[PDB]
Amino acid sequence: LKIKVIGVGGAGNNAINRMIEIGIHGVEFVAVNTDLQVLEASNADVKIQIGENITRGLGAGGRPEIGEQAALESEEKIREVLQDTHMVFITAGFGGGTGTGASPVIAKIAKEMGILTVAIVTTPFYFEGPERLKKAIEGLKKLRKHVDTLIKISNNKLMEELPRDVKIKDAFLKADETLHQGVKGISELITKRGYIRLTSRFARIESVMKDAGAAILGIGVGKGEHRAREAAKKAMESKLIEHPVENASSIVFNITAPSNIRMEEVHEAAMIIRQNSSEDADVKFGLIFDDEVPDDEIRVIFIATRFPDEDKILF
Amino acid sequence: LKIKVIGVGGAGNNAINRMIEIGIHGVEFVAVNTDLQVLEASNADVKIQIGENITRGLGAGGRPEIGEQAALESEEKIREVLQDTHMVFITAGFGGGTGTGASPVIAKIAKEMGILTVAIVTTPFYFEGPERLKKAIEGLKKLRKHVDTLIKISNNKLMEELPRDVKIKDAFLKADETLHQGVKGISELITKRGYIRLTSRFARIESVMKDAGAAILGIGVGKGEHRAREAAKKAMESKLIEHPVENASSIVFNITAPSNIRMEEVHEAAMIIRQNSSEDADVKFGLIFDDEVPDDEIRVIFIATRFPDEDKILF
Numbered sequence: 001l002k003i004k005v006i007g008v009g010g011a012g013n014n015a016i017n018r019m020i021e022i023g024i025h026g027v028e029f030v031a032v033n034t035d036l037q038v039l040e041a042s043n044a045d046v047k048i049q050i051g052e053n054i055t056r057g058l059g060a061g062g063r064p065e066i067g068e069q070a071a072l073e074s075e076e077k078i079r080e081v082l083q084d085t086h087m088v089f090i091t092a093g094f095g096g097g098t099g100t101g102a103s104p105v106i107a108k109i110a111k112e113m114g115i116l117t118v119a120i121v122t123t124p125f126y127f128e129g130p131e132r133l134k135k136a137i138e139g140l141k142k143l144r145k146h147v148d149t150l151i152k153i154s155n156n157k158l159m160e161e162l163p164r165d166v167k168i169k170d171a172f173l174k175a176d177e178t179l180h181q182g183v184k185g186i187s188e189l190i191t192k193r194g195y196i197r198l199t200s201r202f203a204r205i206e207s208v209m210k211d212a213g214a215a216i217l218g219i220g221v222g223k224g225e226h227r228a229r230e231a232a233k234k235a236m237e238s239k240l241i242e243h244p245v246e247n248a249s250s251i252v253f254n255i256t257a258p259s260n261i262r263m264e265e266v267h268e269a270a271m272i273i274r275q276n277s278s279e280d281a282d283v284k285f286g287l288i289f290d291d292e293v294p295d296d297e298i299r300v301i302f303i304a305t306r307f308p309d310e311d312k313i314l315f
Numbered sequence: 316l317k318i319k320v321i322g323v324g325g326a327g328n329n330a331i332n333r334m335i336e337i338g339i340h341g342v343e344f345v346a347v348n349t350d351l352q353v354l355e356a357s358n359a360d361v362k363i364q365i366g367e368n369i370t371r372g373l374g375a376g377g378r379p380e381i382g383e384q385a386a387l388e389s390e391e392k393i394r395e396v397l398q399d400t401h402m403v404f405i406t407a408g409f410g411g412g413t414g415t416g417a418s419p420v421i422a423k424i425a426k427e428m429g430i431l432t433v434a435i436v437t438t439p440f441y442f443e444g445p446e447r448l449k450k451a452i453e454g455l456k457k458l459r460k461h462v463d464t465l466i467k468i469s470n471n472k473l474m475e476e477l478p479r480d481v482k483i484k485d486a487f488l489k490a491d492e493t494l495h496q497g498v499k500g501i502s503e504l505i506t507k508r509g510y511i512r513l514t515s516r517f518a519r520i521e522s523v524m525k526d527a528g529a530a531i532l533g534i535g536v537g538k539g540e541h542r543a544r545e546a547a548k549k550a551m552e553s554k555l556i557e558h559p560v561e562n563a564s565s566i567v568f569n570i571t572a573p574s575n576i577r578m579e580e581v582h583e584a585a586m587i588i589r590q591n592s593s594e595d596a597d598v599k600f601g602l603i604f605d606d607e608v609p610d611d612e613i614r615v616i617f618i619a620t621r622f623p624d625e626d627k628i629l630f
């Protein structure tokens with residue numbers, strides 16, 4: 001999986017530099033601007049200067065039509081950087097010429113390529129004036145037509161959260177942090193598998209199996225639309241069971257399934273547990289995602305222990 | 316984590332060889348027997364001959380008291396093999412002399428040593444006669460005195476699942492498989508992390524973000540006993556949210572938490588979603604176990620999309 005974060009314009013460049021300093025796992029950063037000095041200050045993996053002939057590396061002068069023309073004239077350079085990319089986050093502060101004007105063009109180029117295109121952009125603070133806000137709104141109307149998902153962050157709303165006497169510099173740093181949180185938050189759901197501390201699940205198993213006494217064991221596999229309920233029924237309604245699980249005061253139930261498992265399926269398995277156990281029983285549910293398990297299959301294992309009359313199970 | 320599977324007696328030896336052939340991830344295998352010939356046919360990591368002076372390499376002739384004395388005579392070897400061990404599975408077929416008599420001694424030693432001691436043994440088939448079942452029953456009574464969890468499997472139940480004209484050898488293979496399933500099943504909950512295909516998580520996010528339009532994004536972190544509902548509230552009740560999440564027809568909700576998260580915590584988080592969303596909204600849950608997240612923390616991120624009037628959000 002190839003995921004790129006593209007900062008467009010001054011604000012966008014400033015924002016990704018913060019993301020780079022803090023860190024976002026598994027993504028590549030790209031800085032895009034008509035302002036050469038700002039690009040040179042970028043720590044992104046790749047820097048793309050656009051509209052060199054119309055701006056001469058001096059920025060778009062606050063004109064969105066110039067930022068739009070800059071991106072169009074540099075279409076190939078942009079396309080080139082988007083090759084072999086599965087997803088892209090386009091971030092910028094709308095209100096000026098480059099972020100506002102170039103972002104919709106970059107979005108169109110990416111979506112045209114079938115790339116999952118997500119935009120996370122801001123609208124200007126109130127103190128910035130009406131012209132800035134107007135430019136941002138017109139920019140959003142164009143951006144909207146060329147992205148898969150559009151997350152708009154109102155800087156005015158951020159102002160409401162910030163302290164009464166916050167300095168402008170700090171208000172913008174807050175904006176940077178908000179964009180960062182959004183990009184990192186979504187992207188890491190895809191790039192970070194998550195670490196599993198095996199000693200942690202041994203602790204959960206130990207707490208239930210230590211001095212537990214006689215126990216009922218059940219295993220079941222399921223396949224298809226109702227794989228969960230089917231695996232659950234096979235395990236809890238197993239023939240090996242000589243005494244009703246209904247008498248157990250403790251029940252450990254674990255589901256091992258591919259990442260595509262839905263919460264609804266977990267619920268269906270839970271309804272089976274309830275129909276085969278005491279309402280007063282302490283039920284501990286375990287979940288393990290294992291894509292080594294066939295796409296339409298599921299595995300269930302449960303242990304029922306701590307019965308009132310243990311002799312009913314052993315003999 | 317050091318886990319050992321100990322097969323005691325003929326049935327136990329035969330059962331673990333099957334486990335060894337099929338395979339059980341991350342566990343060590345130990346074969347124990349008075350019967351030297353059978354022991355030499357084992358593919359276990361360690362082979363322990365017990366009662367060399369009492370039975371001289373032969374079996375115990377169906378006498379549990381002999382199996383017991385054999386284990387006691389070879390107690391030093393048993394304690395040696397149980398060193399550097401966190402958990403043990405003691406498996407055998409009760410009814411004969413070695414498995415029935417030696418298993419409780421080994422369990423006693425392991426438990427005294429602080430090892431999580433799980434026993435998974437079988438009671439004989441009806442066709443084997445009353446005497447054998449009687450011996451197994453007395454064995455179970457001794458075993459129960461010193462074990463953490465005692466899982467008893469009734470071969471008579473297995474019979475009610477196989478052909479009417481089954482060959483003895485196949486009845487026993489059926490029993491080996493059942494023992495294998497139990498040991499592998501519980502063991503791998505602790506030794507196998509589970510594989511995560513990242514392209515699969517991308518599919519879940521793509522399905523909700525592709526051509527979704529304007530979206531609302533919320534992020535929250537929680538800590539302590541009610542970390543789940545608190546992180547959910549912070550995300551679902553952000554001041555940046557300009558349009559009620561209730562108007563969204565689609566909602567993706569992901570929880571990233573340590574492996575110690577309880578299913579009850581997912582419920583409290585779920586109740587918050589439902590109280591801030593529409594009953595007709597297609598809600599999708601995501602769960603990622605990441606023990607890099609502090610043991611008492613949790614992270615929540617949600618994206619609400621596909622509204623009827625996006626203008627309300629964008630402008």
Ligand SMILES: Nc1nc2c(ncn2[C@@H]2O[C@H](COP(=O)(O)CP(=O)(O)OP(=O)(O)O)[C@@H](O)[C@H]2O)c(=O)[nH]1
Binds near residue numbers: 008095099124179
């Ligand atoms: N997250 C941030 N937003 C910022 C920052 N500075 C400004 N802004 C916001 O973005 C808006 C201006 O963004 P830029 O400076 O990127 C304008 P851009 O460079 O794209 O236009 P041109 O200079 O005309 O080329 C401004 O109206 C603010 O609402 C910053 O450091 N971080």
Ligand SMILES: Nc1nc2c(ncn2[C@@H]2O[C@H](COP(=O)(O)CP(=O)(O)OP(=O)(O)O)[C@@H](O)[C@H]2O)c(=O)[nH]1
Binds near residue numbers: 325413447
């Ligand atoms: N899972 C299996 N169970 C078996 C097998 N053979 C027998 N059995 C079951 O286990 C019981 C006997 O187990 P063993 O053959 O291990 C008797 P053991 O060797 O422990 O006693 P001695 O020979 O007196 O030393 C018997 O009553 C059956 O119910 C086998 O190959 N696999």
Ligand SMILES: [Mg+2]
Binds near residue numbers: 035096
């Ligand atoms: Mg600029």
Ligand SMILES: [Mg+2]
Binds near residue numbers: 324325374375411413
């Ligand atoms: Mg024997």
